[PDB]
Amino acid sequence: EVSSILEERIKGVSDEANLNETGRVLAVGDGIARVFGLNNIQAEELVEFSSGVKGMALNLEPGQVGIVLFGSDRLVKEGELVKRTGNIVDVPVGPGLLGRVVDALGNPIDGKGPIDAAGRSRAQVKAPGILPRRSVHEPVQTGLKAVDALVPIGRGQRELIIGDRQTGKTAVALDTILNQKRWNNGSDESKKLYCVYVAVGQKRSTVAQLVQTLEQHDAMKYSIIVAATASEAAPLQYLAPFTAASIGEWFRDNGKHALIVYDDLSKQAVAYRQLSLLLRRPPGREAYPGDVFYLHSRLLERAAKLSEKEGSGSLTALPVIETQGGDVSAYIPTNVISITDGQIFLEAELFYKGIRPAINVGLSVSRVGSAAQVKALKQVAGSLKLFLAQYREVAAFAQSDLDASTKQTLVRGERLTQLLKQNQYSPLATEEQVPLIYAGVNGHLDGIELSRIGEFESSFLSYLKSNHNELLTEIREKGELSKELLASLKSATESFVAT
């Protein structure tokens, strides 16, 4: 069994051949070994030490080639062969990576045997050009009611998830992954989004929790989690989103759909800072590496929506940025805000105030907007945007002798706000998003008192399932709400509200 596998493995290593180029470490300090030798070395090429640590050679300096160690300092020690691997940083990519937790290099860290992969592709390749890209046109329903109505997310357009520190930012993201199960399970291959979650700089315990949570909701089977944990060396952390993008490319190029959620680019930044400053490359604004705008921009633009010429693939992306004390003027947030094409701004106050997901309706924007949103959901929730806008403006007036008009707004507004809460770590199908929102929009639930709004929500769903799962099925499949369907819906809501 295991004995046979080991016997296969010993047999599976063979004698080597003469290995071109060698170095001897000139000095190794600070995890920045600087090696004298390596006469022909391609820039950014992976070089392997005597000890067994791997490194890449970010600085090719005029007389020494400055390797950055991908492991603990102790491994390399002054003067020691530095072999030239001879392939610029590349990671296995393929359909086969589906369901394995792999580290930045690509080695299986899930321990579910060798990663079967169909190609190894370089980890720095340039983004799709002007003529390859065709404008966004396919909704991606995240399943959170607030995201799906208030801020639509479409295939192939990066949108930030910028919010306050440890306000369960990751939760908002994780919810998106869960909802993709609904489309994923089936047989329509122009519907499956194969998500890849890139956990950069998160403690190994946190990523273990992530792994378990995904397994619990039976979601590992369209997930690949590239994890470069907090422990892992600063080069590995640096290459972690770049590597991840390459994993995504197989999906994009082969013409599937996929969503890669880089969590959190704030920590990606910190890693780049560590590398650059230690390599003595010139410092820059807020002591962040000089070309830091350029680094983030390279990563985030690999996301795209390919034209029909180029196989109609996509690669939606959702970077998560941690705003330190909510200061959105900070250099690393500001750069990212510019680069991205949308924002979801989770606000700590809202989180505390029990609105979870805590999307601040005002300060979130979708720049690709109406291209996304299921056609049905668009129809019955144009109103929803406008109503909430009024509720925000008239919010402060909730401190007396108030006009009837003002009071009408307040009743409708409070009920809507209460309605848009979603219980954590459970997604909600699109076919039930359109009915629930319909009720609030048509003002049926205005009468219902705030405490009973929650009870009403679940009841409405069960009521819809019993009374007219014909109506629900029509809503789901037709995907567009015809006047006749809206008619039936009005009746159904009337019946439901009456009971």
Partner: protein, 62 residues
């Protein structure tokens, strides 16, 4: 060479150590029965209920 030496040594000189199926049992959840059919028992049999109901709530339909 060294490959051969390792191969030879590993395979030959030691193999699997003891490990019993019985010891395994402790670490796994064992099968147990789905006890009880869980028969429901008839409720409200006879017109005892009916006489009670006709009499008890006399509230007429309006």
């Amino acid at each position: 060479n060294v490959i051969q030496d390792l191969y030879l040594r590993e395979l030959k000189d030691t193999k699997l150590a003891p490990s019993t199926l019985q010891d395994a049992e402790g670490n796994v959840k064992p099968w147990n029965p789905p006890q009880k059919p869980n028969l429901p028992e008839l409720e409200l049999q006879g017109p005892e209920a009916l006489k009670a109901y006709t009499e008890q709530n006399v509230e007429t339909a309006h």
